[PDB]
RNA sequence: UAGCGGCGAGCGAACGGGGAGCAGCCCAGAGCCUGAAUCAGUGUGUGUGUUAGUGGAAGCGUCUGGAAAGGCGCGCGAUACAGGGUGACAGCCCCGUACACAAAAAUGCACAUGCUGUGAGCUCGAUGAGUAGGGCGGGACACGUGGUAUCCUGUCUGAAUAUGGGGGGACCAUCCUCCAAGGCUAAAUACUCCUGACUGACCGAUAGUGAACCAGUACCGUGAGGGAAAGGCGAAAAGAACCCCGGCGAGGGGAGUGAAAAAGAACCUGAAACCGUGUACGUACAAGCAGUGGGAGCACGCUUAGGCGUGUGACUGCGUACCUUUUGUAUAAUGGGUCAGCGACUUAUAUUCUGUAGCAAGGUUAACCGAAUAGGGGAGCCGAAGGGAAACCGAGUCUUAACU
């Protein structure tokens, strides 16, 4: 066989220039009027997947 | 003799009897289990 | 001399053989510890499985869409276009030089190093820095 | 570089990159092991527990016989039982890169020149298709174990070497690493030398 | 390439059973018991290459203590005496002189009492 | 990959590219015109193949040996040194192999040809209706009804018919492309009950078929069904005339054959467990993982007594098996009566890292063609450029009205 991508991980991480993975932050979909604008403004840019989790991500995304 | 010995070792391989150990051996294991409860 | 040929030094590494003896290092448990799901034949959990905690690829939101149009755009360096056989660059003349691909409809002439010959670029988008680099080394860009 | 002809006493001008480079023993070993691996017809199969001719009936009850628990008479622990990791017919071919194959031929040709195992004759043909004539001809040239290689495959030479054990006649196209290394002397026709340089660039 | 394993297994078993000649019963006949006997003999042999140094030393001390008390001084006072007399004869040799040469041992006791006083 | 997906687990295309192979036609329909290509069915002739076959090279002496093909010495064949047998290992002893030939008869294939059937070609016309589409239910499409195109239809309906209709992924318009509701069609392709030849870093009798042997047998089961074990004397039976013990036995001892009968049919080799006979030593006042360290004596061999070696081992210090599981086992926790044979980290394909080898801003081909492990084949893949959700920009880019 040929390795299948964990497909719902491809919709959530995207590869960068030096091999790290970017992802959208959690907590910014609903319940929102209770949150400060400082939280929400700091959750909008995309973020790098941390060191702990790259193992999991590279396992799920073997072609990206 | 060898054929009769293989089949007559094969006698109690698919048994059901619960009061007899291994299908055939008489015991008191009903009273032992029953008294343990 | 077929019994004097010999491989390099370091090329043929041995190969772990598990389950043979005490001296070998990997006997009884073969290097897989005591009981558990991981010491079992077939045993192991699936990918992105954190016990039952919601996995990383599933507690983070999904973003974006796929373009359809970025799969037919390309990106031409300046190291090529001395490779086009002609000194004239269109989408064909690049396809013919095995440099973009047949499905490609759009192309772009990024500064990525060292054009020398005078090249006439036709119908391709050219970046700013590479417009200066094509026009500086003779060259011509029309569209 | 020049190759001294045996009979004409000329010198054939060759490439130093083809007939005068170093012996890369690791490269040659990879191409030799790969050639020999390509020859393996890998035809075999043992029967797994699934293919052994039996039944899936469980031989005794799971509990109560004092026997160890067993489930199939085709277990690999049982006599008559089915190999655990039974083999299948497999392909043993290795990829050799083209530049590694050509590199290996350049190394072995350079060592056949360097060890005086390479003889260059101008012409090498036999009169009639007789093994007696080729036996006498190789006897006159002090050659017993030999790989004749000719740029144009003569029919009579091919029929004359077909019974001789140590002797093998090839065209310049179909040479392999294991025969240049296998045979004691290689006798190339000058035309074969030119074709070899065209092959190996 | 099926490898039968009869000949080499026979050689290993035989190696172990030759190392167990003289053992009682199965310990010299059956492989599965002679293997344990041979190993346990190995562990004891290790352990006892250390104990023979301890056992010989306590034997020698008992003989020097006997012969020295025969010459009117204890072992403790005799070794203190000879160390103060700066005699470095070890006690294998003092035990051996104390058996074979009674007069030399008497003279050693005189050095010990001479320095000890 | 795009997508589908309790957007989970998973499922997973097409476009387009490279190859293998390549072939188009007929009816719905009349007239002109006929046998015009076409195939099908048969006869005959030729060629080739199958079903029996034929010829097929070239050696002797001497030594060991039961026997020579082996050793040594000297010759010959080879388009033939593939293989098998022959009293040990044979190119030249035998069967064969290379090579060259062979069919009265029956046949397969391919041309040619006779007859029958069949219809070419031209002009004009027609150009598939309960159908396409729709509503409801379901299914197939990678696509789970979703914004879902498309196909199939169980049910209810229902057109236009070349100034027409289908598709182009909801849908409309413009544009492009194609002609459903009739049918036939070789090759590339898949498979091996069965036959022949050849091959194996496949097995060698607990393996390989369940089955090397009168094996799907014996045997088990009412039945469907399940399903064994079991090969090897010798080169040749020359397989033991005859005599003795013995029950006109069994078994044996001689004799004889044989190179060898502890090669005798219970037959090559002949292990281990297990059981004996004989010899040396120890052992009947001594407590326990049975050894180990020390160690007297005795018996055999030596040995220019050198005071060693082998066997035994009184007595003595120390010493509670192995496995497994465990915080922890002499544990009175698990497992094992013993021996012998078998018995468990493999294989394939992807991806990542390390070693190593080639080439290097390049590396490499896949299918396939194939003088065929060569060489072609660069379709493609990976890398040399990133940023952004994306358009887009590009050594920058995104954010933001703009960024210290």
Curated annotation (Swiss-Prot), chain A:
GO MF term list: structural constituent of ribosome
SUPFAM superfamilies in the cross-refs: L35p-like
Superkingdom to which the source organism belongs: Bacteria
Keyword Ribonucleoprotein belongs to the record: yes
GO biological process: cytoplasmic translation
Keywords: Ribonucleoprotein, Ribosomal protein
Biased composition (Basic residues): 9-21
InterPro entries tied to this protein: Ribosomal_bL35, Ribosomal_bL35-like, Ribosomal_bL35_CS, Ribosomal_bL35_sf
Region (Disordered): 1-21
This protein's GO CC annotations: cytoplasm; cytosolic large ribosomal subunit
A Pfam family hit: Ribosomal_L35p
Record's subunit section: Part of the 50S ribosomal subunit.
Family annotation (NCBIfam families): rpmI_bact
Family under the similarity heading: Belongs to the bacterial ribosomal protein bL35 family.
Protein known as: Large ribosomal subunit protein bL35
Annotated organism of origin: Escherichia coli (strain K12)
UniProtKB/Swiss-Prot annotation, chain C:
Key words, A-Z: Ribonucleoprotein, Ribosomal protein, RNA-binding, rRNA-binding
Any one Pfam family match given in the protein's UniProt record, by short name: Ribosomal_L27A
One BP annotation, GO: cytoplasmic translation
InterPro entries in UniProt: Ribosomal_uL15, Ribosomal_uL15/eL18, Ribosomal_uL15/eL18_sf, Ribosomal_uL15_bac-type, Ribosomal_uL15_CS
SUPFAM superfamilies: Ribosomal proteins L15p and L18e
Molecular functions per Gene Ontology: rRNA binding; structural constituent of ribosome
The organism's place on the tree of life at top rank: Bacteria
Bias kind Gly residues: ranges: 20-30
Region: Disordered, residue numbers: 1-53
GO cellular component: cytoplasm; cytosolic large ribosomal subunit
Purpose: This protein binds the 5S rRNA. It is required for the late stages of subunit assembly, and is essential for 5S rRNA assembly onto the ribosome.
Family as reported in the entry's similarity comment: Belongs to the universal ribosomal protein uL15 family.
Entry-linked NCBIfam families: rplO_bact (TIGR01071)
Subunit note: Part of the 50S ribosomal subunit. Contacts the 5S rRNA.
Protein name per the record: Large ribosomal subunit protein uL15
Lineage of source species: Bacteria, Pseudomonadati, Pseudomonadota, Gammaproteobacteria, Enterobacterales
UniProtKB/Swiss-Prot annotation, chain D:
Biological process per Gene Ontology, one example term: negative regulation of DNA-templated transcription
Alphabetical list of InterPro entries matching this protein: Ribosomal_uL4 (IPR002136), Ribosomal_uL4-like (IPR013005), Ribosomal_uL4_dom_sf (IPR023574)
Span list, region Disordered: 44-71
Outcome of substituting residue 131 to I: Does not regulate the S10 operon; assembles into ribosomes in vivo
One annotated GO molecular function: structural constituent of ribosome
Domain of life: Bacteria
Impact noted for substituting residue 134 to P: Does not regulate the S10 operon in vivo
Keyword list, A-Z: Antibiotic resistance, Repressor, Ribonucleoprotein, Ribosomal protein, RNA-binding, rRNA-binding, Transcription, Transcription regulation, Transcription termination, Translation regulation
GO (cellular component) term, any one: large ribosomal subunit
Pfam families in alphabetical order: Ribosomal_L4 (PF00573)
Keyword Iron-sulfur: no
Keyword check for Lyase: no
Family to which this protein belongs: Belongs to the universal ribosomal protein uL4 family.
Subunit structure and binding partners: Part of the 50S ribosomal subunit. In TnaC-stalled ribosomes forms part of the binding pocket for L-Trp with the leader peptide and uL22.
Note: The erythromycin sensitive allele is dominant over the resistant allele.
Protein's name in the database: Large ribosomal subunit protein uL4
Organism of derivation: Escherichia coli (strain K12)
Curated annotation (Swiss-Prot), chain E:
GO molecular function: large ribosomal subunit rRNA binding; mRNA binding; mRNA regulatory element binding translation repressor activity; structural constituent of ribosome
CDD domains listed in its UniProt record: Ribosomal_L20 (cd07026)
Disulphide bridges, residue numbers: none
Entry annotated with the keyword RNA-binding: yes
One CC-aspect GO term: cytosolic large ribosomal subunit
InterPro entries tied to this protein: Ribosomal_bL20, RIBOSOMAL_L20_CS, Ribosomal_protein_bL20_C
GO biological process: cytoplasmic translation; ribosomal large subunit assembly
Keywords: Ribonucleoprotein, Ribosomal protein, RNA-binding, rRNA-binding
Job description of the protein: One of the primary rRNA binding proteins, it binds close to the 5'-end of the 23S rRNA. It is important during the early stages of 50S assembly.
NCBIfam families attached to this UniProt entry: rplT_bact
Quaternary organization: Part of the 50S ribosomal subunit. Contacts L21.
Similarity section: Belongs to the bacterial ribosomal protein bL20 family.
Protein's name according to its UniProt entry: Large ribosomal subunit protein bL20
